[PDB]
Backbone:
């Protein structure tokens, strides 16, 4: 059972920072690529970031790239998103997702939280 | 892991080709897991097999083994359905001991994947030139 | 004689850009499938160095940024990364006919 | 190709190491090119060997073969030079016939290079778990 | 000398054909150097090989040896990729002793190259007529 | 062809000598045409022999064969007629099947004639250096 | 290391003569075809002459043919150009070059001098 | 590495003579690589050979061997060919273990060279004086 | 001549190290003359020996022999004295006849020195690469 729960959450002001986390049990965490996908209050999905198996190849979109940062901990099986500068569009749900066994991700398993 | 569809990108000399490989079950009598392409005729399929064998009373080594089989097919003069003309194979065997750490195994894997994209090996494999 | 009209003789190209050089021969260059056109590079205090021979083949010490293409009258030399070193004049030469004729040159 | 030095970057599990390799010539008995690690002592260096074999009267198809071995050095007590504890091995063999094209051979090479970074082969090679 | 690309001109009956031959390395296990044409499929290539053997405890002669292999290929009825139909060979062996001067060897070489363009041999080789 | 005299000009390393050759008939045992040097004595002349062999029940393809030998004459002391010290040999054999065309055979002949004037075969034949 | 150095040089009047030379170490000199290629002060290259392996087949252009003459010395490994009649266009650099293993030359190795 | 033409300068008692060596292939049976001087009549050439142990995995002793032989020519009265009166030999063997480093081997080589340039050994060899 | 203290300069992979050798007498039983380095604990000294055949009247073959050995020190844990892990050897033999001249011997010595300074042999010895 692929399980993904999130922490951090938050209610911040503008220009602040926060660190979202993800716990990721049920499977061999260090093999798979992981990803963040947020959902706006007007119910639109947006890709946020992806990372590789060992944390080497990291992808961001242009709306995100200067001020978000993701990382892994393959010993604690944790996924991390470092949010910063928070310019008031960042008011979404921020799901975790496991990427497909592939080249570029299609999310198969999802985590509800935050 | 669990067998799901493996999709591989940046393949070819140009690096602009993909390939999807769908799971075809694990064979219980040798432990070989199988991935294949999406055709109807089974002789025309590009397939990948992968296994890993535990130590026994004979070998005393962990043995990982990957095989790749690509047929090329064409229809001949006076023939209707295509037949398989050629076979291009590949056969990788990894061998490790009981006291090896995982970082050693990951080093050997990434070392092989980095050698396969170096001009020495892409000249020895593509153009069939011994290193001289 | 076969006259090679090289190109407009200058290129204002930046560092990270991608620069093409043309060379247009008078007559045909082929004698079989073989293109008889060559590209040379001359840096201003030293003789020309043979960059590519037979219009598509890298000489044994060029860094594979350089590439050549073309057919029968029209030939192109292209540099991709276009680093600091690549600032030199470039020459196109034929050896199909008996008077060996050169191009005028393209500084950049 | 020419036996030059080979720098293998973005190697290892984290993907941040390098492995630099100096050419050790070919072998007039076998026809096998060799490459070792920069630095070394002998018997404590990481080795890469590569051979290419043409058709003959015995085997009709070309055969490329890569073979990488790497040891683990343990410093025992009372001695100044290390011993080898573990070897890790990998050896790929490619088989291509005489009417195969450059595109097919490049497809096999780049398919293997892309496939060794897939989670099935991550979890098979450096965790030793089979597929299920 | 050193293996670079050999381009040969004035070939054929008309004498208006060329051929370029690209280096394909020296084989360490017999000393045979190789030149080939510029195809992708290795069975369709016109190739030239050249070697020279030193005296030993058995032969006591310097032995130069050149071979030429030209396939002709065509695609058949109901076939897609071309297969090799015919092979035209050539096999020259030069033999010299330890006390021969270089002018003798150059005389034999130029004598052969001048015989190959004389009407006796171009009638015996092209039209297959014994000298009568 | 007809066995006539053959003048071979632009011969030797400088390319300024001639070798004139008088026909010595054919051999009813072998079927081999012979030609010797103008002037001579026997056993001190330069010889050219040429044969053409048709298909049979033993060999299926045509075989043309040229064979040139030339001695070196040394005048010892106490004798008036010279002895032979060294022989230099060359023998070409061409192999062509029964469906080969005149253009292919002329291509082989003129390829060998053009190739023996290339710096690889200069430096292989009259300097005895291999390729590297 | 294919090395080619030149001598002769010169500052002459019109209608004179001069003999350029070339030293040619690093390789087996007597196997390869050699050539002269001059470079005008307006930076244009011009083929001057070619010779064969033993000095038998010599090629000149029409602007050169009556008044230049090249030769080899395969024992001293020297290449020679005999310039004569010097009609004031002959004010160039006059490089040596080694020809390709071919039929008609493309210059692979060059000599700086004069 | 790969053999090339070695030009050695400033040789002799005065320090002016040169020696140009061309490569002459690798013996496949023992791996000995030859270099020889471009001189006419190949029995009268300056010859140099070099032999290195091939890198195995469990070799204990690496061994390098260099041999020099220079003959002298004597045109004996009453013959046409020069013969060999004298040879001059040189035989250098280096012996290393598998834990030796690059600097130890380099120190031994440069030490031997600096001794051969030293007045102890250009007096024991050039003038044949034993050190006492 | 008579032995003296030999100071050798510019030794090593970089070309900076020195080696000061002091004389250590002549062995009367075979005439071998020793030189050794001023280092404490005389089992750990750089040692050089030189041996020349003594000039008789009817000696046919003059023979020079030079030997170098350099040990390495290892202060093993659990002892008070350093021991010898490794030796590095060098053995040079020159062989001449009684009609050889001074310039032939000097040419052989300076040739061997110029080869040891050449990149063929500071690659076969320093990096242990066989020439191919």
Residues:
């Amino acid at each position: 059972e692929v399980q993904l729960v999130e922490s951090g959450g938050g209610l911040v002001k503008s220009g602040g920072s926060l660190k979202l986390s993800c716990a990721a049990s049920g499977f061999t965490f260090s093999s798979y690529a992981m990803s963040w996908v947020r959902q706006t209050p007007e119910k639109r999905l947006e890709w946020v970031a992806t990372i590789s198996d060992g944390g080497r190849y990291i992808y961001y979109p242009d709306n995100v790239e200067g001020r978000f940062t993701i990382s892994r901990d393959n010993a604690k099986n944790n996924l991390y998103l470092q949010m910063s500068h928070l310019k008031s569009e960042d008011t979404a749900i921020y799901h975790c997702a496991r990427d497909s066994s592939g080249y570029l991700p299609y999310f198969s398993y999802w985590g509800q939280g935050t | 892991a669990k067998l799901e569809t493996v999709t591989l990108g940046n393949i070819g000399k140009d690096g602009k080709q993909t390939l999807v490989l769908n799971p075809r079950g694990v064979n219980p009598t040798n432990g070989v897991a199988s991935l294949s392409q999406a055709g109807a005729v089974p002789a025309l399929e590009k397939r990948v097999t992968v296994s890993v064998s535990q130590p026994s009373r004979n070998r005393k080594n962990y043995k990982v083994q990957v095989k790749i089989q690509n047929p090329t097919a064409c229809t001949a003069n006076g023939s209707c359905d295509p037949s398989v003309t050629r076979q291009a194979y590949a056969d990788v065997t990894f061998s490790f001991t009981q006291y090896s750490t995982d970082e050693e195994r990951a080093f050997v894997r990434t070392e092989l994947a980095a050698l396969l994209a170096s001009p020495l090996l892409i000249d020895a494999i593509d153009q069939l030139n011994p290193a001289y | 004689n076969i006259v090679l009209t090289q190109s407009p003789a200058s290129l204002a190209v930046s560092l990270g850009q991608r620069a093409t050089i043309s060379c247009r021969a008078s007559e045909s260059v082929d004698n079989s499938g073989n293109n008889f056109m060559h590209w040379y590079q001359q840096k201003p205090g030293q003789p020309p160095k043979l960059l590519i021979y037979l219009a598509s083949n890298l000489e044994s010490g060029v860094p594979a940024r350089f590439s050549g293409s073309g057919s029968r009258t029209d030939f192109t030399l292209t540099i991709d990364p276009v680093e600091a070193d690549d600032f030199a004049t470039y020459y196109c030469q034929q050896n199909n006919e008996v008077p060996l004729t050169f191009g005028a040159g393209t500084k950049l």
About this structure: The helical segments of chain I are 102-116, 121-124. DSSP finds two helices and six strands in chain I.
